[PDB]
Amino acid sequence: SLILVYSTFPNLLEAKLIGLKLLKKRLIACFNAFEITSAYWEKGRIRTRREWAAIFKTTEEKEKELYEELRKLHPYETPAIFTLKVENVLTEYMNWLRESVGSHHH
Amino acid sequence: SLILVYSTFPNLLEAKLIGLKLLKKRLIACFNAFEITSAYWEKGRIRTRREWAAIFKTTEEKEKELYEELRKLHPYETPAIFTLKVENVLTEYMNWLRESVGSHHH
Amino acid sequence: SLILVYSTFPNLLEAKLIGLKLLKKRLIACFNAFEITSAYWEKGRIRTRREWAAIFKTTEEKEKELYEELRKLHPYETPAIFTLKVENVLTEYMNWLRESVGSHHH
Amino acid sequence: SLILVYSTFPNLLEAKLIGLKLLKKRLIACFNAFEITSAYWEKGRIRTRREWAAIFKTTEEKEKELYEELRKLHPYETPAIFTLKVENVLTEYMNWLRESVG
Amino acid sequence: SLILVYSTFPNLLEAKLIGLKLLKKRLIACFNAFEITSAYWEKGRIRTRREWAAIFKTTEEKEKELYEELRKLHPYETPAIFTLKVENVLTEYMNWLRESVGSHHH
Amino acid sequence: AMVYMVYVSQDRLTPSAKHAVAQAITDAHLTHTGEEHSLAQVNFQEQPAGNVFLGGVQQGGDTIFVHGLHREGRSDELKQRLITDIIAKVSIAADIDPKHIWVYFGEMPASQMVEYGGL
Amino acid sequence: AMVYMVYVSQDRLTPSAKHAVAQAITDAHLTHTGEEHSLAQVNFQEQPAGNVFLGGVQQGGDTIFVHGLHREGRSDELKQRLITDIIAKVSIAADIDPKHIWVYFGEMPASQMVEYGGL
Amino acid sequence: AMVYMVYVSQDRLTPSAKHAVAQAITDAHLTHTGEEHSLAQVNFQEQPAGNVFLGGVQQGGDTIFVHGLHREGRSDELKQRLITDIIAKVSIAADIDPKHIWVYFGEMPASQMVEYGGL
Amino acid sequence: AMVYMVYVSQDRLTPSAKHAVAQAITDAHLTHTGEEHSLAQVNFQEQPAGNVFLGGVQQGGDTIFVHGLHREGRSDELKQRLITDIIAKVSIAADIDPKHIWVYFGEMPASQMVEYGGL
Amino acid sequence: AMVYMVYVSQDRLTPSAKHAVAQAITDAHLTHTGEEHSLAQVNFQEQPAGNVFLGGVQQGGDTIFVHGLHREGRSDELKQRLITDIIAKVSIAADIDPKHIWVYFGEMPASQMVEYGGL
Amino acid sequence: AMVYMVYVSQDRLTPSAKHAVAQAITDAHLTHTGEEHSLAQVNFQEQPAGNVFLGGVQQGGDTIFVHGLHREGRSDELKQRLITDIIAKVSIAADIDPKHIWVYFGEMPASQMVEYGGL
Amino acid sequence: AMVYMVYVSQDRLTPSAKHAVAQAITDAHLTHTGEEHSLAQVNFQEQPAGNVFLGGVQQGGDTIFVHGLHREGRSDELKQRLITDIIAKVSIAADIDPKHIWVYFGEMPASQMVEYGGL
Amino acid sequence: AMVYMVYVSQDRLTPSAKHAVAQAITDAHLTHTGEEHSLAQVNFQEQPAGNVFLGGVQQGGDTIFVHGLHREGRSDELKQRLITDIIAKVSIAADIDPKHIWVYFGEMPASQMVEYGGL
Amino acid sequence: AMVYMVYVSQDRLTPSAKHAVAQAITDAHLTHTGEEHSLAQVNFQEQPAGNVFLGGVQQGGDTIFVHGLHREGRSDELKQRLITDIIAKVSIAADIDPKHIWVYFGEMPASQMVEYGGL
Amino acid sequence: AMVYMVYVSQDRLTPSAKHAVAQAITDAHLTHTGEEHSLAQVNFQEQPAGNVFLGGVQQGGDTIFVHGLHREGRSDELKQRLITDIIAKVSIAADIDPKHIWVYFGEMPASQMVEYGGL
Amino acid sequence: AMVYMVYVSQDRLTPSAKHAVAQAITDAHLTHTGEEHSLAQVNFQEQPAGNVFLGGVQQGGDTIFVHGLHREGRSDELKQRLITDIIAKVSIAADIDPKHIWVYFGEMPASQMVEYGGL
Amino acid sequence: AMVYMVYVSQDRLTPSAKHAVAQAITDAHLTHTGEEHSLAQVNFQEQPAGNVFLGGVQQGGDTIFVHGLHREGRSDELKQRLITDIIAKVSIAADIDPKHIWVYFGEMPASQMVEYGGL
Known part of the structure; x- marks a missing residue:
């Protein structure tokens, strides 16, 4: 299922660097x-x-x-x-989201 | 109750046009x-x-x-x-949302 | 646990004044x-x-x-x-939130 | 009736000061x-x-x-x-003129 | 064959207007x-x-x-x-010149 | 109280459509300028279809050109938002593909823009 | 030899009213510029009544919008006196309330304003 | 993709003469700007003969006034070449004396000029 | 709604003299600006006599220094007429020699001047 | 290390309320300038109640006027955020209606602003 | 004849100390501006100790803030020397650590600085 | 099509890392500029480790200086975002601490920047 | 005596080709600037082939980037002609396609450009 | 924290000479700028001897070009002194004739210069 | 204390006429400037009659050309009133037709205008 | 109707030579300014031979210095052509080596250049 | 090679005194401009004693007025040093009280200053 995780950061570069590190680790899709x-x-x-x-x-x-x-x-x-919990999601988006963090990338 | 539907767009104009179209069709309140x-x-x-x-x-x-x-x-x-689902909403605001999309077409 | 209450305001000043008032009364953590x-x-x-x-x-x-x-x-x-209800929150952050509105301030 | 008195001044401040003094003394109305x-x-x-x-x-x-x-x-x-003497003058304006200076 | 006719004018506008007129009447190729x-x-x-x-x-x-x-x-x-007379001209260019003032336009 | 010249083809906008477009432009002007009073002018300029050419190709009656005449001094951000809102709001109000809407803003010193006779 | 676009409703100005309004703007231009030679253009743009909206409210055929296109480099004093003269003279020549008259002046570099073909 | 407002008299330009004039202005625009993609707009604004006055003199249906709306930043030499080309090419395309053609160019920041809805 | 800081010696202006001096500066501001609504601030800053030095010479309690803080963009003419009106009106309202009155005007961009909290 | 002159009425701010207002302005200054080193000056200027007039109306002891003296070169967005934060934070810190708070920012070249003797 | 507002704590400067400070500022103004006549104003603004905060920390009565209001046009070199001299000369005249002296210069057009009533 | 000179130490980036760094900068350029197709140049300038000195201290091979050469006219906001994106994306692509990345942008008139021979 | 940094791939230019390229740039500089004797510097910066990326695509050894550092004050026309001459002359001298040549000109105040130690 | 690109020939400077040259430039930067701690970068760019041409003449390994990249805002005097100090100090440190040293300074807005990742 | 070069034909002004013309220009200068002290220079440059050509036509000895060299910073109003006063007064003082009088005003920065040796 | 002061030695130009020089300068002014009417002034200023020094060396009577006083606004191209034509045309008209001719152009606002008494 | 017009009285300067004055001005020009090549022009303009008036007072043959015609772009400090040197050196060379020497410098773009025919 899709989940949203929220956080705040002191500046843009700190937010972007952590966000890009999480994608590189396949821990988030977006x-x-x-x-x-x-x-x-x-x-x-x-x-x-x-x-x-x-x-x-x-x-x-x-x-x-x-x-x-x-x-x-x-x-x-x-x-x-x-x-935050999501109640509904576009099916084609959920499949794109699951592939981004799937086990095949590791 | 009230539901919130989230989406992203390549630019402001595309987001505005679609939101205004959805208002015109009485599919969203805001x-x-x-x-x-x-x-x-x-x-x-x-x-x-x-x-x-x-x-x-x-x-x-x-x-x-x-x-x-x-x-x-x-x-x-x-x-x-x-x-996203909401747990609670100000009663009078919920009344305003409902009327905005009421089947009386206004 | 943690709740998020969403609202909108005609300008930044009105938003900040109300938000600072709520903090001053110990009704919100941030x-x-x-x-x-x-x-x-x-x-x-x-x-x-x-x-x-x-x-x-x-x-x-x-x-x-x-x-x-x-x-x-x-x-x-x-x-x-x-x-909006929160499905999960970082333990230490919840403790900070709780203290900010604790009865000891009153 | 109404009379006009003309004068010149080295600068606007002097003219403005003297005029505001004459209005404060009720000697002129405008x-x-x-x-x-x-x-x-x-x-x-x-x-x-x-x-x-x-x-x-x-x-x-x-x-x-x-x-x-x-x-x-x-x-x-x-x-x-x-x-300068005036031949004629609007009645209502004369009344306002007499009241301002008494 | 090709001839070049030279003239001078008091300004660009006069030169262009006359040159465009001559093209419009099919009297010159360019x-x-x-x-x-x-x-x-x-x-x-x-x-x-x-x-x-x-x-x-x-x-x-x-x-x-x-x-x-x-x-x-x-x-x-x-x-x-x-x-000015021309001693020689590129064959294909001469053909283009000839067509531009050919009788078929009239 | 700026002026919006709106160049459209004859019979493209019914009387109620013209009102809806004028309302959309005027609402956007109020929204983004912050003027307390609604005094802006929307001035429709109708021509027969076929008088607009794009890239040398004659068009039908679907083109809309908005020429806004504004006082100078407003930020680039403000003008950008106002233009985007005019395009979006007019597209809905006129039910017209936004690719058919052009918007140009010209600026002048406020001292040489006189509305309502300056009185 | 600058141009005044005069936006008006059809049938609001008879051919003689147009003449008077044109003579009014032209005299004002001559007076406040130093042209000596009378060469200013007045260009009437007529549109059906109800095509003008003020604050979102549809108008009759009384509004007059004069868009002046001028060479840059004239003083604020001169431009203010010219606008004022235009308001007054057109008000008389058209027998119309001044509050119905709007006047905007745009300015351009003289090098990109060409009259009579530049000849 | 600049805009050329072309103010002419009704019935002066046939549909084919309109296409040729629009082709002249657009060709000149491409030639001197270097766009490569032909996108400029020519917008013909027709009025009855007699709506144009020159130095107070009412005209027939001959006068042509081109108001070109352009982004700023182009050189003075480029603009003068473009204006000259517009006068000459329109004169030939419309079979009209160049003295009847006026050309004014107004300029605006590119940020506040949106064409084709900005898409 | 700009502010005038008025620097004066204690006991030099009775409460009614302060009222008159305040009404004088406020009327001048209204007259020469186009505010329509009266919102200008007069802020009296009192200090013991002998706190003012002119050319190194200690003064009594007669000197008045008015520091005006204004939005930029007003003409030299307007600013000159306002200062002159302030000198004259305060001279009358305070029953004081004009030579004792100094007036400096500072100017700021309007965007960084916020009155009444900006509400 | 900019200077904020804070004009208030005597006995309106207790010693603790003064510290909280000064802490509000200074915190806002650090937040938006990014100094890292807290050095700004808040200089309270007290006058008896009744020395402030608004549109000619004598006030009680509520009005607060902040005159901020800053180096030039900071963005318009930074200054508007700082002004907004000063109004809101001082309103909460002083338990005062924001409509009683005026904020003006004047700017100077950094070369002619010396703090702490320049050492 | 510029104005120097000097913000100090009550009882920090005796009457003879105020004279010595005023003399030091005025001498420096003459020295560096080259004015033949001494007409500058030094205007002392006293507040109770504890009204100055630096970095949010309440101060004693040792702070001195000089706000000089000058006509524009003087070079950066001239202003730099004048500020340095004010700090040095006031430090001696008041027997005060120079780290306690701040000096800000604001500039205005000469035409809107009127001393001695402009007469 | 702007140029990014990227100064790095020999052996710090493998060919695959060079590709990754080059694509990160090129993607960022594409992202924040509006250009349709990728044309920007990334030009790696390698030197032996030890040729970089920071505050007089000889460094190893883990410093990167990006000198971007751009046409003038882009907003401060765009340049900030593009710089921030370059630092973040190069940091990931090179697996390098961001504190080791410096980025300077120089601007030139577009007329004196010629890519691909100007053809 | 301006500086031309010329970025090329190792082994692309033999010493004789370097001479030819250097003389082409130096002759062009002499031609279009008025300087009497040749003093301009050409500084070849070689890097291994593969260090240049265009639109993300790794190149071979056939790209040339000329970065010219010049004093300000030269006309647009002169700079255009000089750039064009550099591309054409380097193309011949290096026997390289002109589309492989990029040329950027940066300008500085002449006071902060010092050649030959300033002696 | 400015950047000095220092273009020299391979083998002209030993590592100890590089240190000496780097410290000379860094000390000069510290001296003439007011910065507290040393942060400026010196980036040596070595190339084989013969890659420098002066007036078309191929040089040996004894030329040095220093390209300094600085934030704007510093006085002409400061830049002159700093350039002079760099030439004199590098001359001693490199045991090189000063006539072999060229120094150019380019300036950028400080907002588009980011050192140490901006952290 | 600015200078008026007055170009005239020999024998056209007697020694007393020169005195009157000089007193005329000097009075006008005093009137419209705020010098208080009379220090303006009138410098007669006499040349034989027939040395002046107007439109290629040789003139007699009636033409008078006054070249004023003034400090910059005076308003257009002031300069217009001074020129007009010079024309009228010289016309009277020389008993000469105004059409024979030309007056040009040049302006310089005050710092490069030194009178009476600067002592 | 600009003014050309022409500084020559006595007896160097016969009456017919002066006419030929004046004609040459005036013709060139007409040619390049496009003025329909010939109104320019050529004003010969003769001095005895030996009053001109070049590099401190006394000259004979062959020097010619033309000081043209022009209205501002004309392009650099126009002024360059006009200067070249003056040198060439005067060289022929006076039969004088062109190396003996100097030409300086000074510019002023048109509003402070009054010819023919302004009537 | 600037031009110095030197207005003196007939018979005040002998041929040797003229050479010494011209040598003084030229030496000062070389000293402060740094030409290296002595090319400046000193052009003596003699008039009969009594043609100079100061504050209306007719003079003897003492006054000297130097009008220096220079290219723009030189610093304020360089010009003030040059003016001071001209006053002092001419005072000694001509045995004249410095109070009799006036020096004005006018500036022009270098493009419109041609010396020695431009060859």
Whole structure:
């Protein structure tokens, strides 16, 4: 099944480098990154920051490996990482997605 | 309830045209489109590409028609199309979405 | 666990002011806001509008207070507000989220 | 009835200041200032000079007080100050004119 | 065979208009025009003038009609018009020249 | 209150279609300029079909050319979005292939653009 | 010898009204330029009433849009006086409310403006 | 793919004369720009004879005014050669005195010129 | 809605004198700008007498320095008339010699001037 | 290390509210400039309530005017993001309606801006 | 006759210290501008200690910020020397570590800087 | 068709790695410029390891300097994205730390850049 | 005395061909610049065949990239003629197809170009 | 952190001479730019002797061309001094006649120069 | 203290006429400049009659050409009023027809205009 | 109607030679400017032989210096041709080695060049 | 080879004093331009004493006015050093008070300055 994994990054290059490393490792089939502005508490006051978000699309079987690799690569010590469920998907897209991370590439 | 259907497009104009067409056909109540950059495998290596993502919001009754019409219009041969379900929605906003696609044709 | 509440705003300032207010009241742990373009029916024709979307992250215990506060603060009469559930979240990130809205701040 | 009093000034600020003082003293009810270029005899030769002309509008009973106060305020030692009588004037405008200066 | 008729004109527009007229009447096969500077005696002193020269190419059968037409169209009272003979010409080019002014066009 | 000259073929747009196109252009002008008041002019210029040539080839009545006359000073980003919205919105409003829509923007100093007689 | 495109509704100006409007714009041009020779072009573009939309509201046949195409290099003062003279004279010559008159001036380098074939 | 607005009088150009004039302007555009792909637009704008005034003088149906809308960045020499070629080629193609032909070129940044819907 | 910082000595302007000086600068701003809506800020900065030095000579409490912060793009004529109006009106409203009044105008791009929170 | 002059009313900001406002402006400065080294200056300028007039209307002690003095060369997008962040963060830090906050940015060449004695 | 706003803490400069600082700034202005007459304004703006924050850290009363408002046109070399002299001369005159002195110069067209009422 | 000079150490890239690096740069160029077909040049300049010095320190074979020679006219945003994409894609393709990659872009008028002999 | 960096493949040019190519470029430089005596530098940069990629395709040893570094101030016409002459003359001298020759010209202020140590 | 491409002949500089030359250029860069820590790159490009031609004359191994790639914004004076210092210091370090040293500086916007991957 | 070169024929102006013409130009200069101190130079350049040609026709001794050399930075208004005043005053002072008077104004940067040795 | 100051030695040009030179300069001005009317001024300025120094060496009476004062706006090409024609035509008309002729052109805005009293 | 017009009074400079003044100006020109080849022109323009007026005051034969005609592009520092040297060296060479010497420099593009017939 298709899963979406979301994370944020301090700049575009960090997002793109990690995203390309995940594709090279066949842990994801695709990523969509977009620029964001963020806010959160840190060191006693609300911080605001410009960031890049990324959506990593992969199959359910890859989720655990994806989490562990994303954690090891991330510039943040405690990064945002969470998964969204998909209810429906275009069948031809799902097949393209499964082939991208299939066992034959390894 | 409310469903969200996600897709990506090669440029803003293509995304807008398809979203506006879907509104004209009363297949969606709203769309939100935003600029992305993506990567994926294509023709032997990892491609990078600037795109536009869009979320189409509509009722679960319209999902089948939406998938069919979006696939007919999409510039991509094998587009990304998948559905996210929502756990809750502001009651009055749900009423606004439903009316937007009501069979009374407005 | 983690919930995401989505809304849209007429400009960045309105989005940030509301998002900072929600953090100040300890109702959300953080937000990510991004620029969007949208379309929808209004007064007999399809309108287009440039907006800012925002994802507010918080605990499910805070969802009802968040909806009620966002509704009172939003500049729109009938704002888009809906919730996406998260299938999985990085343990350490969940702990950071939980602390940000913990009772010890009040 | 209505009388017009004409004078020239070395620059707009001087004209504007004097006019605003006469309005604050209720000696005039309005003035129209406009830029001019002028020539006249001064140092045994024709001097040219860019100036500002002013037309002060008031009632005839205020002419004496207007002349004397304009002379005190004027930067020129021997300034141009003369009056023009009007043959006719819109009734409503005269009423506004009399009220502004009392 | 091929003849070249040379003339000069006060500006490019006059040269082109006359040259296009001669082509429209099928009197020449083509012209080549180039910018020049000139000098000559006029009204008691040497004058200098910037002009455009033109070479008109056509068949010797058309020379007399060309001279007479050019004379009626030229803006100068006493224009320079003279003919250079060609010792040799590429066979295939001569055929192209001949066709351009052939009787079948009339 | 800019001016949009809209060059179309006669009988291509019904009276209600002209209204829908004019509404689409005007809505987009408001959306992207941020003007509080709707004062823009849409001015339809109709000619018989066959008067438009593309690459020297005579066309039917499906071409639409929008010439927007704007005050200068707006960013490239703003103008790009406004042009894209005009193409998309007019395509829907007129039910016309977007490849048939051309849009050119000319700019002038605001001091030499006088609407409503300057009063 | 610059050109004024004058956009108007059919049947709004009789042949003599067109003459007066044309003489009005031409006199204003002569007055504020230093042409000495009268060579300015007025080009009436007529369209059926209801082809003009203002703020999305369809109009009758009263609106007049004058698009001036001028050589660049004239002062803001001169251009402001010319526009004002055009508004007033056309208002009189057409017996029309000034609020119905729009005037935009475009400017080009003189080298790419050719009148009377450049002859 | 620039746009040439061609303002002529009704019934002055037959359908074949229109094609030849459009072919003249387009050929000149390709010749001097170097496009290789013929995409320019010629858009004929017809009005009744008598709608054109020159120095206050009402005209017959002879005058032709070409308003060329171009991207900026082209050299002065290229534009003058293109204008000259348009006058001469249209004069021959339309059998018209070159003194009846006016040519104005306006320029805009390429970013705000979209042809064929931008696709 | 631009701001005038007005630097003055304590106790030199009574609360009503401040009102008059504020109304004077605001009227001048309205007169020479085209705001229609009155939104200009006057911000009095009071300091003890003897804090101003002119040519190294300590002054009493008579000097008034008005620092105007304006959007760029206004003409030299307009700015000259506004300064002159400010000198005269403040001179009257404060009952003060004009020689005691200094007025400097700074200019910024409008995009980096935000009034009332930009709402 | 830019300078932010913050004009507020006396007794409106407690010592802790001053620190939080200064922390808001400084945090925004670091966030958007990318200094890495926190060096910017916030300089609070207090005046008695009633010294601020808006459109001629005397105010209470609510208005806040931030005059930011910056080196030139930063993008328009960076400055607009910084201004927006200053309004929003100061609004939350000072518990004040954003409509009471004005932000102006003036720019100067870096060569004529010396901080910490230039050492 | 430029203006130097000097932002200091209350009670940091005695009356004789203010005079010595004002003399130092004014002497440096004369020295480097070459003006024959001493007409420059030094305008002291005092606030309670603790109103200056550097990097978000509250300061004592030792900070000095000089904001010079100058006519444009002076060379970079001239402005650099004048700033260095202000820092050095004020450091001596006020007996203050130079690291505590900041100097910013803003420039304006001379025509919109009016001293002594323009008379 | 721009030129990328890519300075690397002898033996650092195998022929297959050269292909991968060249395709990464060429794909990025295709991606962020709009050109239809691939024409950009990648020109590898190899030198023995030890010929690169950073802050005076002799390096090994793991530094890459990309000097891109481009026509002028592209937006800052496009150039930023293209540089970022080159660093990220070359990093993957060469299996090299991104901190070892430097990228400089020089711009020239398109008229003085000739590819393929200009034919 | 400008610099021509000439990037070619090892073994493509014999020493005599290098002389011929160098003289062709130097003669062209002499021809189109007015300099009296020959001082321009030609600096051959050889690399192994296969280090050049065009549209992602690895090339052989038959590509030549000439990067000319020139002082600013020369006309477009001169630079066009000089580029054209370099391509034609190098084509003959190297017996190489002209489509294999690329030529880019970069310009610098003459003050920051120093030949022969500046002596 | 600017880049100095240093073109020299194979075998002209030993590794110790390369170090000395690299440190001379890097020290000069440090000296005349204000940067705190050394980050500038020196990139030696060696070629066989005989690949340099001056005025058509083939040279030996005793020519050095330094091409410096810098961010824009530095004064003419600074660039002159830095060039002079490079020639003098490289002359000593390489024990080479200064007349054999050429130095060209090219400038780019700092936004399109990225060192150390931009991290 | 700018200079007016006044070109005239010998014996056309008596010593008193020269005085009057000189006083005329000097008064005009004083009037329209803000010199306060009278320091402008009038420099009569006399030549035999018949040395002036107008349209190739030799003239008598009536023509007067005034070449003004002025500091740049004065407005078009001021320069127009000064020229007009010069024409009128010289016409009176020389008892000469205005059509015989030519006046050209050249402008230079003030830094390269030195009067009275610069002392 | 530009002005050509012609600086020559006394007795070098007879009255008929002066006429021939003036005719040559005036003819060239007409030829290259395209003015329909001949209004240019040639103004001969004679000095005794020995007043011209070249390289510090006193000359005879063979030097000719033409200082043309022109309106700005004419192309470089036009000015180059006009200068060359002046040198050639004057050389013939005066029978003088062209190496003895110098020609300098100065340009001014047309609005500050008044011929024939501006009437 | 620039031109210096030197306006002096008849009989003020003997033939030897003329040579020394010309040698002073020429030496200064070589010194500061760096020509190496002495080619500049000094052209003495003598008029009778009494033809120079200063502030309306007729002079004796002392005043000297140097009008230097130069190519543009030279630095402000170079021009000020050259002017200073001309004043000082001419003062000593002519035994004249420097207050009698005026020096004006006008600049022109080098393309429109031809010396020695351009050969």
